[PDB]
RNA sequence: UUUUUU
């Protein structure tokens, strides 16, 4: 009540079928195709694959894709493969590695078609976890089943034995309102934990799976949606002593995080086990006797580390990965619940749930749901914002610990009704050995305006933007030789276009402060919330006459991309092109009133008089 | 709408 399923089938016949359209209108949406007159050039690995090299007139490595003969100089053919070379140093020959070497048409070279491969495994996951609700009536406790179903069900209290202290060691002493979020939520199997940016939502959450870690009683699963969530949680974890491991995707295994020392297959390899770690170095070959040696060996310690965790952290689709199968969980957390589809989270709640926690904060980013029709029938709406709707009291955390008073105003009182408050001061937040120059001293903040244009980057759907590139780059030099170290900075823009071109200009050409660089994160917007740095660096690309600013537009993800510093925040950008939407235009005179909208060379900067519409 | 996930 209101909103009331009958049971889990029911429940499943409504979820099943808007993931369905979600996942066919992204495949349609997502997939390309050649014209069917490449000319491709065979040959063979050194194990004995079967290779097409071709040249083309957007792929990236690890990616599926379909080559299809039609010519008639052979029979029709189609065969999967993958991306094992893209266009580079060596030459703009892209090479896909054939699943099967035969009987591929190795005998002819033109009229081949190349399709790109949609993947479906994150979409299969959602969909097995609403079927494993519906059909396996174990897969969550009863009172869980009858909550999530908006059944009317007695509260339930969980007899646990409380801890001598809610606060942690190795984390922040929680105040009142924390410990009060620990103290109540350890005693509940359903709770919702709701709170403005750096009210300490995750440092609670941390303390929260310390303690049900330290009950004894088996590993905690703790999920978040993006992977950056996951590694700010795993960290602070880490952070009390317990035993973490950090079970990542097969396709970042080889992606650097502070946390790459708690991923499972790192940690796998550091074992001995010194057989499996031969055949390891081996494979760093291919021997299909060997590999059934090396598969045992590796369940062998899969299960050895992650039944001795203390704690199991993923992402929420990470949740449905076959290491974890036959696994169950009595305890399960997930943070920053707000930015996953209900069906998302269901991943891991099918695990065997008998208490859930809940983290969000639904001003930020939503799930990502691209087709519009879907999402106005309800995929949009998270979980979390459900149980709301339904009636459950979230606990509210309000006084933030993160950033300088100044750079919660705007926030505060434009996204949180003035009710986010600060846990800490102006002083608090002057930087230590830090001689940087605001236009404003007493406001750690401004807008750099940056006449530009956007372009559309190697992608086709994204935007990059070189002058405010350029800029970023100056400012972070700036930053930098003002005492600023290259971890204490982070650099933020909504497009990965814009990402992947910071990443390359900065970091991958011959830049006299490279090493520097390449110590500095640059990310996009949606992929950091949660984590926050000293300093923060924004680009907002768009710069345009006439074509608007796409999902800039969306107040959600302003609001996560002004709330990710703590000391100070620079934001580079086109007034121009943002000034025509309300919100981007209310932020602009915000700062123009505060006389932070700024111009000029970096060393000498004058307000901008420059107006916008 | 071009972002999250695999
Ligand atoms: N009770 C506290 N005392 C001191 N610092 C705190 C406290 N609670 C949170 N913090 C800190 O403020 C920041 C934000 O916490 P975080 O958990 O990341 O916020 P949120 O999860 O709500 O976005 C961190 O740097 C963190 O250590
Ligand atoms: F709510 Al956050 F970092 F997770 F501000
Ligand atoms: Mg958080
Ligand atoms: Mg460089």
Same mark, same amino acid.
């Given at each position: 009540?209101?909103?009331?399923?009958?049971?889990?089938?029911?429940?499943?016949?409504?979820?099943?079928?808007?993931?369905?359209?979600?996942?066919?209108?992204?495949?349609?949406?997502?997939?390309?195709?050649?014209?069917?007159?490449?000319?491709?050039?065979?040959?063979?690995?050194?194990?004995?694959?079967?290779?097409?090299?071709?040249?083309?007139?957007?792929?990236?490595?690890?990616?599926?894709?379909?080559?299809?003969?039609?010519?008639?100089?052979?029979?029709?053919?189609?065969?999967?493969?993958?991306?094992?070379?893209?266009?580079?140093?060596?030459?703009?020959?892209?090479?896909?590695?054939?699943?099967?070497?035969?009987?591929?048409?190795?005998?002819?070279?033109?009229?081949?078609?190349?399709?790109?491969?949609?993947?479906?495994?994150?979409?299969?996951?959602?969909?097995?976890?609403?079927?494993?609700?519906?059909?396996?009536?174990?897969?969550?406790?009863?009172?869980?089943?009858?909550?999530?179903?908006?059944?009317?069900?007695?509260?339930?209290?969980?007899?646990?034995?409380?801890?001598?202290?809610?606060?942690?060691?190795?984390?922040?002493?929680?105040?009142?309102?924390?410990?009060?979020?620990?103290?109540?939520?350890?005693?509940?199997?359903?709770?919702?934990?709701?709170?403005?940016?750096?009210?300490?939502?995750?440092?609670?959450?941390?303390?929260?799976?310390?303690?049900?870690?330290?009950?004894?009683?088996?590993?905690?699963?703790?999920?978040?949606?993006?992977?950056?969530?996951?590694?700010?949680?795993?960290?602070?974890?880490?952070?009390?002593? #317990?035993?973490? /491991?950090?079970? &990542?995707? !097969?396709?970042?295994? @080889?992606?650097? $995080?502070?946390?790459? +020392?708690?991923? =499972?297959?790192?940690?796998?390899?550091?074992?001995?086990?010194?057989?499996?770690?031969?055949?390891?170095?081996?494979?760093?070959?291919?021997?299909?006797?060997?590999?059934?040696?090396?598969?045992?060996?590796?369940?062998?310690?899969?299960?050895?580390?992650?039944?001795?965790?203390?704690?199991?952290?993923?992402?929420?689709?990470?949740?449905?990965?076959?290491?974890?199968?036959?696994?169950?969980?009595?305890?399960?957390?997930?943070?920053?619940?707000?930015?996953?589809?209900?069906?998302?989270?269901?991943?891991?709640?099918?695990?065997?749930?008998?208490?859930?926690?809940?983290?969000?904060?639904?001003?930020? #980013?939503?799930? /990502?749901?691209? &087709?519009? !029709?879907?999402?106005? @029938?309800?995929? $949009?709406?998270?979980? +979390?914002?459900? =149980?709301?709707?339904?009636?459950?009291?979230?606990?509210?955390?309000?006084?933030?610990?993160?950033?300088?008073?100044?750079?919660?105003?705007?926030?505060?009182?434009?996204?949180?009704?003035?009710?986010?408050?600060?846990?800490?001061?102006?002083?608090?937040?002057?930087?230590?050995?830090?001689?940087?120059?605001?236009?404003?001293?007493?406001?750690?903040?401004?807008?750099?305006?940056?006449?530009?244009?956007?372009?559309?980057?190697?992608?086709?759907?994204?935007?990059?933007?070189?002058?405010?590139?350029?800029?970023?780059?100056?400012?972070?030099?700036?930053?930098?030789?003002?005492?600023?170290?290259?971890?204490?900075?982070?650099?933020?823009?909504?497009?990965?276009?814009?990402?992947?071109?910071?990443?390359?200009?900065?970091?991958?050409?011959?830049?006299?402060?490279?090493?520097?660089?390449?110590?500095?994160?640059?990310?996009?917007?949606?992929?950091?919330?949660?984590?926050?740095?000293?300093?923060?660096?924004?680009?907002?690309?768009?710069?345009?006459?006439?074509?608007?600013?796409?999902?800039?537009?969306?107040?959600?993800?302003?609001?996560?991309?002004?709330?990710?510093?703590?000391?100070?925040?620079?934001?580079?950008?086109?007034?121009?092109?943002?000034?025509?939407?309300?919100?981007?235009?209310?932020?602009?005179?915000?700062?123009?009133?505060?006389?932070?909208?700024?111009?000029?060379?970096?060393?000498?900067?004058?307000?901008?008089?420059?107006?916008?519409?």
């Amino acid at each position: 009540g209101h909103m009331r399923y009958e049971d889990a089938y029911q429940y499943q016949n409504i979820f099943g079928p808007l993931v369905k359209l979600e996942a066919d209108y992204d495949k349609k949406l997502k997939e390309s195709q050649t014209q069917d007159n490449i000319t491709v050039r065979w040959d063979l690995g050194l194990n004995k694959k079967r290779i097409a090299y071709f040249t083309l007139p957007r792929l990236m490595q690890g990616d599926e894709i379909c080559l299809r003969y039609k010519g008639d100089l052979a029979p029709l053919w189609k065969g999967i493969g993958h991306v094992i070379k893209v266009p580079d140093n060596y030459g703009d020959e892209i090479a896909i590695e054939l699943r099967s070497s035969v009987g591929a048409p190795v005998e002819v070279t033109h009229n081949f078609q190349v399709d790109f491969v949609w993947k479906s495994t994150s979409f299969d996951r959602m969909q097995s976890a609403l079927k494993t609700f519906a059909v396996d009536e174990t897969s969550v406790s009863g009172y869980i089943y009858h909550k999530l179903l908006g059944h009317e069900v007695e509260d339930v209290i969980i007899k646990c034995q409380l801890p001598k202290r809610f606060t942690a060691q190795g984390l922040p002493d929680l105040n009142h309102s924390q410990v009060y979020a620990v103290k109540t939520v350890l005693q509940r199997p359903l709770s919702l934990i709701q709170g403005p940016p750096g009210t300490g939502k995750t440092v609670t959450s941390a303390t929260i799976v310390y303690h049900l870690a330290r009950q004894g009683n088996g590993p905690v699963l703790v999920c978040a949606p993006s992977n950056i969530a996951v590694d700010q949680l795993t960290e602070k974890i880490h952070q009390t002593g #317990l035993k973490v /491991v950090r079970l &990542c995707a !097969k396709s970042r295994e @080889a992606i650097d $995080s502070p946390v790459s +020392f708690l991923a =499972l297959h790192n940690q796998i390899r550091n074992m001995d086990s010194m057989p499996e770690l031969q055949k390891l170095q081996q494979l760093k070959e291919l021997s299909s006797a060997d590999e059934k040696r090396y598969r045992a060996l590796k369940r062998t310690a899969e299960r050895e580390l992650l039944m001795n965790a203390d704690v199991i952290c993923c992402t929420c689709v990470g949740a449905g990965d076959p290491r974890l199968a036959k696994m169950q969980f009595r305890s399960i957390l997930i943070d920053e619940s707000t930015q996953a589809t209900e069906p998302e989270c269901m991943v891991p709640v099918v695990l065997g749930a008998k208490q859930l926690i809940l983290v969000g904060d639904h001003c930020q #980013l939503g799930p /990502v749901v691209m &087709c519009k !029709k879907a999402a106005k @029938a309800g995929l $949009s709406q998270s979980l +979390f914002e459900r =149980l709301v709707v339904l009636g459950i009291r979230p606990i509210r955390l309000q006084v933030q610990y993160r950033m300088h008073p100044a750079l919660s105003a705007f926030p505060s009182n434009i996204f949180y009704e003035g009710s986010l408050q600060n846990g800490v001061t102006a002083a608090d937040r002057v930087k230590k050995g830090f001689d940087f120059q605001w236009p404003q001293p007493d406001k750690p903040m401004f807008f750099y305006v940056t006449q530009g244009q956007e372009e559309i980057a190697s992608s086709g759907t994204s935007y990059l933007n070189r002058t405010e590139a350029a800029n970023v780059e100056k400012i972070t030099t700036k930053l930098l030789k003002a005492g600023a170290k290259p971890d204490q900075i982070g650099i933020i823009t909504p497009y990965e276009g814009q990402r992947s071109y910071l990443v390359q200009y900065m970091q991958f050409s011959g830049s006299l402060h490279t090493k520097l660089y390449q110590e500095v994160e640059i990310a996009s917007v949606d992929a950091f919330q949660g984590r926050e740095k000293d300093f923060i660096i924004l680009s907002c690309v768009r710069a345009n006459e006439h074509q608007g600013i796409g999902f800039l537009n969306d107040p959600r993800r302003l609001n996560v991309a002004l709330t990710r510093a703590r000391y100070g925040v620079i934001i580079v950008g086109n007034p121009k092109a943002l000034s025509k939407q309300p919100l981007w235009n209310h932020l602009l005179n915000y700062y123009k009133e505060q006389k932070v909208l700024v111009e000029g060379p970096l060393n000498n900067l004058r307000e901008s008089l420059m107006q916008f519409s």
